[PDB]
């Protein structure tokens, strides 16, 4: 009843985000505040098209925004952010409750620098 059409492996390639879950969770509220626009566009595309093959460009834009966000963090607040996500990573549940000091330092770093 027809042939399933799949995108080739050449246009499925994109620059990945090679940080861990703890790193992502540390810079998560800032990430949600900063890259809101591409992420919301991608989610609207996914929920309207109901097809992974129709929103690949939005996914690549999401990856680009994430990489821009992380390069901005890296160029200004590498050390406070490293301390923050190091504190987050230790916990088994990755609790925000146990790192309220490093989080304050990171928020102070990004409120001034960025």
């Amino acid at each position: 009843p027809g042939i399933v059409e799949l995108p080739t492996l050449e246009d499925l390639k994109v620059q990945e985000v090679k940080v861990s879950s703890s790193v992502l969770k540390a810079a998560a509220h800032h990430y949600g505040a900063q890259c809101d626009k591409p992420n919301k566009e991608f989610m609207l595309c996914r929920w309207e098209e109901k097809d992974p093959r129709r929103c690949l460009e939005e996914g690549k834009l999401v990856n680009q925004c994430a990489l821009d966000f992380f390069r901005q963090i890296k160029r200004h607040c590498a050390e406070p952010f490293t301390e923050y996500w190091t504190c987050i990573d230790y916990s088994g549940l990755q609790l925000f409750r146990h790192c309220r000091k490093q989080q304050a330092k990171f928020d102070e770093c990004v409120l001034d620098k960025l």
Binding site: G32, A33, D36, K40, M43, L44
Partner: protein
């Protein structure tokens, strides 16, 4: 009222366990309809975001839907912060 008082006196002297059981059950049934915090509990259960908040396609006539999460439009949990 004298009959009720005598019955309660006799029950408290013979079956205090049953007296306490019925008192606790009656308090459990009646109190929630009078407490002002039941609505607060309902709102707290509502405010928990289990699933993803799918965005709406803007038609240009949605002034009450924020364009960004930090915009003043949208639900506010300031009441929950100071609670």
């Amino acid at each position: 009222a004298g009959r009720i008082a005598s019955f309660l006196k006799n029950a408290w002297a013979k079956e205090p366990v049953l007296v306490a059981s019925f008192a606790i059950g009656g308090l459990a049934i009646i109190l929630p309809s009078l407490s002002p915090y039941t609505n607060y509990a309902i709102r707290i259960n509502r405010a928990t975001p289990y699933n993803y908040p799918v965005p709406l396609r803007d038609d240009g006539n949605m002034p009450d839907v924020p364009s960004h999460p930090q915009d003043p439009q949208g639900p506010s949990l300031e009441w929950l912060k100071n609670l």
